[PDB]
Structure 1
Amino acid sequence: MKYLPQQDPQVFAAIEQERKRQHAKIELIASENFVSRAVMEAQGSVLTNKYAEGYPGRRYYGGCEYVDIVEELARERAKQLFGAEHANVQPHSGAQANMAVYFTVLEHGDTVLGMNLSHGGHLTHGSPVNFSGVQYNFVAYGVDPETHVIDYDDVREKARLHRPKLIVAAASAYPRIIDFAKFREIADEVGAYLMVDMAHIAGLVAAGLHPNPVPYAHFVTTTTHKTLRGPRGGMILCQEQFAKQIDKAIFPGIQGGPLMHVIAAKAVAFGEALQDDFKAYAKRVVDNAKRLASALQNEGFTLVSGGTDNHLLLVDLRPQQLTGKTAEKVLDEVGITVNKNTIPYDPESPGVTSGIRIGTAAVTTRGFGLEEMDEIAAIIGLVLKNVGSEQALEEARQRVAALTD
C-alpha cells in the first residue's frame, strides 16, 4: 500500500495487525481461506466508481461497456466451472443469494424444508431470528443419531407431511457428501423446487471432488469465498428457464447497484479455479481433512459421522468432558483458530455447544500438507487433554509458532 499509510494511519495500523495475525495463527475455521493478490487487486480497482444496475447489454446507465465485459467473464467462467446454464454473479453475499432464490419462488408464509440448524443447516435456512424463518414457514430434516448422516427417509417423510414449496439441501457444518439425486427424487415426489446451497463445498464441486448439484437442483446458491477461494460475495446458478426470474429477483428485486469491483474479483477467482493447480489444491484440501480427521482419532477424539468426505470435520468433545466454548477459548490461547459448533443432538445450547468445527481450506492454501495435519492434531491433543497446564499451553504455543514460522 502507498496512499492509505499516509492518509489514515489508524486504519492502516489495524489492517497491518490483521495481516500479521493472518500469518501468525493457524486458521482452522472451516469457512475461512486466503485469496490471491490478483483477487485483492481487482477489488481494490476503480470499478467501485461505476453504477451498473441491470445486466450486461441491458443496463439502466450508459458507459457500462467495460464493466459488462467483466460481468460476462464472471458469468461465463462460472458456467464453465460448474456446467450451469445460467449464472447471476451480482449477489452481495451468500445470504443475499439465498434471499433472491426465496424471493423468486416463494410467497410470504410458504413452507420450506431445510436441514436442521443444530445438525448442520445454515442461519439462512430458517433461523427464527433470520429473515428466512420470519418470512417463511421452515420445517427441518435431521441426520441419523448414530451415523450422523442425513436421514433421507426423514427428508422424504417431512416433505410428504409438510408439503414444502421448496426443499433446501446443503450445510455449513456437515462433514459428508450430500446426495443431491435423492433430494431431487424427494422434491419431485412432492412437487417442490430443489435449492442447493453449496457455499461451503463450492471449491470442491469445482474441482470434481464433491458431486455437482447443478444437474439436480433448480437453483444452486453459493458464496464466492470459502473453499472456492474467491472474494467475499454470492452467486446463483440455475437452468435457462429460471434465468429471467432469478435476474429480476436480484435486481430490481432485492438489491440495487452491484459491486462491480467485487464482480471483477469473482471473475479472477473463477479463472483461478478453472486452472489445473486449483484442482490439485482442492485435492490437498480433502486429503488434508482426512489426514487431520485420522490423526485426531489417533489422539482419542470422537468425530461427528466418524470422519469426513470434504474439507471439514466436527469434534464431539463429550468424551473429554469439554464444551465447544471451552475448547475454542483454550485453543485461542495457543494461536489455533477454531469455532465452537453445535453437534447433532447436542445437549448444550448454541452459546456453549459440545463441539468444535475444523476445516483445512485455509492451512492448505498456506501450503500445509499431511505432516502438518499430524502435528496440528498432536497440538490439539496436547492442549485439550491438558487445559489446566500452562506448561502444556506454552509448548503448544511454541509448536504453533514452528508451523507458521
Structure 2
Amino acid sequence: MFDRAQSTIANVDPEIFAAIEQENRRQEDHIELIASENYTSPAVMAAQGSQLTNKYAEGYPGKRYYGGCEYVDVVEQLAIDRVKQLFGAEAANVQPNSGSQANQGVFFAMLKPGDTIMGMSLAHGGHLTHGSPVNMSGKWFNVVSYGLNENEDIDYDAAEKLANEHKPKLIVAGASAFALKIDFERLAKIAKSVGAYLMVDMAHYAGLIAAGVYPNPVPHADFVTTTTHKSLRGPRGGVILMKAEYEKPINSAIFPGIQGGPLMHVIAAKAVAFKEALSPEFKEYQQKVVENARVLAETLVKRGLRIVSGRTESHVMLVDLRAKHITGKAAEAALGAAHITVNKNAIPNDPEKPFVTSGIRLGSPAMTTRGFGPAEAEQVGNLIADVLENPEDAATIERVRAQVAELTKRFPVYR
C-alpha cells in the first residue's frame, strides 16, 4: 500500500483512474473559453502531489504549534515573499483554502454579523461572494450593491451616493464578468470619504495584474483577495494581501479563526506558480491573453454580435446574443456539442429568466495557455458565430467540431 511501484491509481482504484484519464482527454479535446478556467503547469501539479500533504502546520512560519516545521516554513515563506513581490503588497497570507476562504478571512477579521457592506451587483458582473443572499457574504451581512451605468461601465457616481447613504463598514470591488479596467483609486477615495475599508477581489484579473497589463489595486486597497488559479494559472486556492497595519487581524482570522491546518502541498504549488508568474515568459503570456481576447471580441462584432461595455480591456468579455435570436442557455449547449466550452451569463437588463439568459461569457486565458495566437482567436470567433447562426443544424455542428479537432490536435495542452 506504500510502495510507489504498486500504489498507482490504476492498481488501487481503476474506476478513479479511468475517470481521470477521460478528464485528461476532455481537456485536450475541447476548446475551453470559460474565463475562470486555465491549465496549470506540471510543476505546480507535482508540488500538490507531494508528501507535504502529510504535515500538520497550524500557525505561521517560525510560530507553529507543532515541531518539525523547518521545511514547510521555508515553503510558506517563499510563497509569501514571492506573492508580495508580484503585487507590491506590504503583507500576505498564503493559507486560504480557496478564493471564498480568502474573502471570508477578511470579513472575519474586520466585520461582525449584521454589518453593512457594499459590493458590485451580481446581475452586473459581481461574484457570489460579494454579497449574494445565499452566500455567507449576503446571508449574515447587510448588503448594498452598486452596478453599471447606461454605457455599461461602473457607475462610480452612483456607488458614491450609495456609500454616503448606507455608510458601509467595508466596500468590495472586483468582478467575475466585467471586461473593463476598474478604477480602484476612485473606489478607494469613495471608501475613505465614508470611513470604509476597501477590499478588492482580483481573482479574475490577478494574472494580468502580475504582468502589468491590468491596473493593480494593491496601492489603493486595505485588502486584496484572490484565487491562485484562474488567470494567475496556479493551483486551486486563495491568498490575502493586506496593508501591514492589518497583518495581525488577518493572520489571526485565517488561523485560528476560520481554518485549521494549511494545505502545505498546495502552498508549495502556490510558491511554484508565483515563481512562474515572476518570469518574463509569464508577462508575454498575459500580453497574448489580452491580445487574444481583443481579437476574439473584434471577430464576434464583425459577425454581428455585441460586446457588453463595447470593448474588452482584459481577458474576458460578455457577449449579448440577441441579434442572433439565441439564448445563453441554448448557445452554451450548441457550442458544447461543437466542442467549444462557454458559459451562459445574464446581460444588463436581460429580458430572459436567470437560468436562460441572453449572453455568454468568454475568456482567453486557457486557449492562450495551450498556444493559440491571434489567427486562432479569430478562427475561434468565426466558429462560434457559425454555431450561433445555426445552432440545431447537425451539419454545422459537425463542420465546426471537425475544425475544432484540427486546432486541438495542433495545440495540445500537455506534452
TM-score (norm: length of structure 1): 0.99
The alpha carbon displacement at 1:314 in A equals 0.6
The alpha carbon displacement at 1:349 in A equals 2.6
Q: More displaced, 64-73 or 317-326?
A: 317-326
CA distance in 1, matches of 2:310, 2:326: 18
What amino acid maps onto 2:389 in structure 1?
Answer: K
Equivalent residues in 2 for 1:330-369, closer than 5 Å: 330-369=334-373
Q: Secondary structure at the match of 1:124?
A: helix
- Tell me what 1:185 maps to: 189
CA distance in 2, matches of 1:202, 1:137: 28
Equivalent residues in 2 for 1:1-400, closer than 5 Å: 3-145=8-150, 147-400=151-404
CA contact (8 A) 2:334 2:392 kept: no
Q: Secondary structure at the match of 1:91?
A: coil
CA contact (8 A) 2:181 2:214 kept: yes
The alpha carbon displacement at 1:342 in A equals 1.3
Q: Secondary structure at the match of 1:199?
A: coil
Gaps of 5+ in 2: 410-415
The alpha carbon displacement at 1:348 in A equals 2.1
Q: Secondary structure at the match of 2:234?
A: coil
The alpha carbon displacement at 1:300 in A equals 0.8
CA distance in 1, matches of 2:322, 2:106: 38
CA contact (8 A) 2:304 2:323 kept: no
Q: More displaced, 98-107 or 216-225?
A: 98-107
CA offsets, 1:225-269, max 9 Å, x none?
000000000000011110010000000000111000000000000
CA offsets, 1:199-231, max 9 Å, x none?
000000000001110000000000000000000
Q: Pairwise CA RMSD of aligned residues?
A: 0.9
Q: Secondary structure at the match of 2:40?
A: coil
CA distance in 2, matches of 1:386, 1:326: 11
The alpha carbon displacement at 1:347 in A equals 2.1
TM-score (norm: length of structure 2): 0.96
CA distance in 1, matches of 2:130, 2:408: 36
The alpha carbon displacement at 1:350 in A equals 2.3
CA distance in 2, matches of 1:257, 1:163: 36
CA distance in 2, matches of 1:104, 1:324: 39
The alpha carbon displacement at 1:281 in A equals 0.2
Q: How many residues align?
A: 404
CA contact (8 A) 2:177 2:361 kept: yes
CA distance in 1, matches of 2:312, 2:261: 40
CA distance in 1, matches of 2:185, 2:350: 29
CA distance in 2, matches of 1:186, 1:110: 18
| Sequence identity (%) | 61
Q: More displaced, 308-317 or 343-352?
A: 343-352
Gaps of 5+ in 1: none
CA distance in 2, matches of 1:320, 1:128: 33
What amino acid maps onto 1:33 in structure 2?
Answer: N
CA distance in 1, matches of 2:106, 2:349: 29
CA distance in 2, matches of 1:138, 1:350: 20
CA distance in 2, matches of 1:349, 1:253: 39
Q: More displaced, 382-391 or 60-69?
A: 382-391
Q: More displaced, 119-128 or 313-322?
A: 313-322
CA distance in 2, matches of 1:105, 1:350: 33
The alpha carbon displacement at 1:318 in A equals 1.6
CA distance in 1, matches of 2:351, 2:385: 23
